[PDB]
A paper describes a structure:
COPII mediates Endoplasmic Reticulum to Golgi trafficking of thousands of cargoes. ER export is mediated by the coat protein complex II (COPII), which minimally comprises five cytosolic proteins that form two concentric layers on the ER membrane—the inner and outer coat. The inner coat layer consists of the small GTPase Sar1 and the heterodimeric Sec23/24 complex, whilst the outer coat layer comprises the rod-shaped heterotetramer Sec13/31. Here we visualise the complete, membrane-assembled COPII coat by cryo-electron tomography and subtomogram averaging, revealing the full network of interactions within and between coat layers.
Residue numbers in the entry:
A (entry chain C): 378 to 469, 493 to 690, 694 to 745
B (entry chain A): 378 to 469, 495 to 690, 694 to 745
C (entry chain F): 2 to 157, 169 to 292
D (entry chain B): 2 to 157, 170 to 292
Amino acid sequence: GEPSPAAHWAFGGKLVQITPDGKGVSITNPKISGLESNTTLSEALKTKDFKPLINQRLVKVIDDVNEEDWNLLEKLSMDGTEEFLKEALAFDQIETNFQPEGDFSLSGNIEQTISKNLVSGNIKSAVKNSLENDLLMEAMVIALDSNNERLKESVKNAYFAKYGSKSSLSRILYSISKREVDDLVENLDVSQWKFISKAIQNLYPNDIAQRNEMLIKLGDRLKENGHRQDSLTLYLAAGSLDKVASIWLSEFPDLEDKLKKDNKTIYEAHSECLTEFIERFTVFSNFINGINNEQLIAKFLEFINLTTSTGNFELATEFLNSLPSDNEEVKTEKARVLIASG
Amino acid sequence: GEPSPAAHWAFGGKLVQITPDGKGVSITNPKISGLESNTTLSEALKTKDFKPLINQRLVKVIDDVNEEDWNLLEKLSMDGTEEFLKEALAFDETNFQPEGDFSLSGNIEQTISKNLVSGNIKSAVKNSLENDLLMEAMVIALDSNNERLKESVKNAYFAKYGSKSSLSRILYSISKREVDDLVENLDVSQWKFISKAIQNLYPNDIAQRNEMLIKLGDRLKENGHRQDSLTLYLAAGSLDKVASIWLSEFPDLEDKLKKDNKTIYEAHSECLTEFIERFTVFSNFINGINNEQLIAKFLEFINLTTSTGNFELATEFLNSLPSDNEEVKTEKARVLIASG
Amino acid sequence: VVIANAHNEMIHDAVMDYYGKRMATCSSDKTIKIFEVEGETHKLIDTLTGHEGPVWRVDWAHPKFGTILASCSYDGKVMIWKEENGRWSQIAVHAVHSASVNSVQWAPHEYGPMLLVASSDGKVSVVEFKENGTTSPIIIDAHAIGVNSASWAPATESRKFVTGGADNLVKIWKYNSDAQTYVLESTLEGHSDWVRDVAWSPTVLLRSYMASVSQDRTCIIWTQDNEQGPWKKTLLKEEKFPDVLWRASWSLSGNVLALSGGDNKVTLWKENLEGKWEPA
Amino acid sequence: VVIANAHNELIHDAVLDYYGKRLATCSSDKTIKIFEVEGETHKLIDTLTGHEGPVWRVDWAHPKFGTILASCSYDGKVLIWKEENGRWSQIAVHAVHSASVNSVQWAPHEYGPLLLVASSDGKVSVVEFKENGTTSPIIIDAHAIGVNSASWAPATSRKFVTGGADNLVKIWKYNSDAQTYVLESTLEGHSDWVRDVAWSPTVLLRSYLASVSQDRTCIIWTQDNEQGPWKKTLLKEEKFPDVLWRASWSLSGNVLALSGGDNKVTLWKENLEGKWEPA
């Protein structure tokens, strides 16, 4: 029977204790240095104005990659998704005088047989002979006068068959002529990506699914070839929040290790890394076109928990509602918060 | 007053004399060995079957050249005009699979590539031509419909090749739907070709088709292709050209005959006959009088014929002459009374 | 959010449901009270009665088994009451010990509807509530003079719980299907006087954290890393807190120390980067 | 085709016209007769009367002047005749000679309606028929003893050959500074009277003349060109059986028709050698 505050912590960051007179009860929400309710995020997520959050994060960014990220977000918040994509995918007669002169003559069985096909009004065969013999321009100059297709192309396929492997320009011509981009998306130098990108757009203007499938493919290459910032660009334009979540989910562990070295405790490290991971994501997730990822869900659920402890049941509810109500965890949690806040 | 036959010759090759009784007159048509009415001609000109006539001249032809003409006519006889000009004017890798990495090397390539994708098919060609990427310029154009562009390149190919390649110069002509160039400069040896380029470009404009065929014949004949220029003429329906050639070849022909042990008359006689039978049979297969000398020599054969008594064959040739010529007029009248 | 003067007699415990919407107060008046808390409001519902001596501590069961609150009193008995139909009734009465029972906490729902009872009768009991009503009790002697605390260890057999001695000794107990009951493990010594309270943390991080408060007027945070690993004694401070130390509580997450003194002041503590402790 | 008994007195001339269909005869009966021969038939058409002596010869004119016939006779005159509207009538009469006229011949139609006349009086006359009708001729002394024939050379400049009883053959050409036909060449070669002379109408470079004589020989005179002389060439090395009386050239082929006294007609042509032979 000795007096005592008999405290206990409780869900939501509430502390209970018996009052000094020992006949009453107090219930408060203590101040823990370094532990405040994320008001900016609550605001931003309510307003849909991330300018304030972007700037707060931009003022004390950690490593450079991250800085580039928030820098990206900054520009993306001013110019707006569409205007950003336009500025991030953008790029930095003749001589005719021939007069026949003097006497000439056909020489050789080749020159002589092609002409026999021309006058004999046998244009079809004239083209074949020009080809079986290395008279390419010839066949072209000829077909370029006919309106036959199956032929008008036989000349083309011959041009590719022996020059496509010898000239890049030739190879590009191949895909265009054949109305494809796989080759350019798959093998063209990752440096000319703006050309591929642009190429994908001009081939699938009405097939947004295909376009995105290609832009994401090109996106993967850039990333896998030291072009992280550009990969985010193509992913954004393809509306693939998944890929950006993976790039970011993977670079997570290291990020929390550099913060660990900044003389931060295990809690301090984990906490800041998570919150910053979530902020960067909530923001970016606002300018894209989109939660199934298992890893992603567990962190949102990790953010929820840090959230409810700052007491901000409201913000917590916001995030729980973005998760698949099919997860008996997200389900259970919803219950707790609900009952706790309402 | 002494007695005497008092013989006289009269038109039609008739001989008038006085009977020994001194009281009678006797008209006749003496047999002059060497002179014989031309039956074959009269009979073939009616039955229009010169098989025999042709077979006669052929079997008794003179110099080598003459033989060709009659042979030209011997075969023209069987096969027919149309079928002849036929046998006489005819003649004897895809795939590629791209592989591995690659990249736009250079400014040229990059500029053209950007053009393409940026749906700017027009500029791609401009940038191409302003470089020696003609092959490509052509490939792009072989994909659009735009004619002016689909043609700005042809005129660009020829611009620097139609002069270093005979086939290039020929294309230049086939392209621009013309023959003037071939017809006037392509080697005469490949005439059977300049021949097909006329029937090919002017298949529905005969006046022009024949003006060109003619323009060629003249060139052949004037450059050692005598036999051939006749074939072209035979197809252009220009009996006048064939007539003119034959009238110039006349003299030398009468000379080779005069050296063949024949009197000035036998030669002159034989010659004008061969020419007339050769001209008649030829004018009978082509699509054809306004040539003076021809007329002049036509009249000549008339007299030799009347002198044979064959007034019928004489009238036939009289008819074919322009009833505008007085000599033709007079003889027309004379032959009439003489026979009628 | 004060609930001024909830009782007449001095209050001995203030605990809330898992959803901090309903409280529970217990005092010497041998009575416990249920509550509703909102923004600053406090609706008083029933008042639990059947306890002969002063009620000591109480503990809210997991919602998993409905609304249940257990209380232990000097009367050597712990009692639980459910709230079927919004009306509080006494479900079962547990009185195996012979003398005051000073602590009673519930086992993580995973384990089940288990209750850990620590009496001053020197023994401790483990009781799970079957169906029909009759439970299978488990008792085992734990300390010399008596027992003052009996906090549980998170789920992982592998069922552990710390005990605070009346004889100054803190212990660790782990189930054992072969022993049929929880047997001893550690025996961490450290306090010169009696172990007033000991609470075990739920912080699943790399190392285990255990708190021990005592009449010796000090807290010894027992940190261990793995099976082998021994527990590292650690003075929350190399001085004495002016008065005793009655309670120690662990925060849900962020692992912060709630140390309810005796000088009537509550202090909060955290382990800075090195591994020591500081306020908050 | 024979027309026996066309006359009862001996006949001296029978000539067919431009169409070689209209016959005409003359003889001692002092008359001319017009005939129309076809296949092997004939029909008299008239009998010309006027000559006071046997008629020696007749010559049909070119159709472009009308249907005329000229005749000459031992009576020393020449009568032209016409068949206008279907009946023959003496239009004009030429008589400037004082002895038998033995030949008469119409010039080439190009010269107009001119007549070449030769007489036993030794002279030759050239006659045209004025715009009004009358006649203003050319009279030349052309042979001693008598002239028996005269023939016109073909047209280009106008020439004609005569044949006298002085055994000579003679070419004549018209001259301006004389307004008469002047003696161009005298050809010697017969040893007796020349009975007839015929200038061939052949249009070849070479000119051909044929003279016939009382000496039983025919001579073909030829002239290569203006610079050439008239070369003599006997028709045949051996003399003939009787007197040759006439010579006539065909219109084509340059074939000569010789009329002998043995009342026989021989025909000749030229060969590679330039010598004659039976055609």
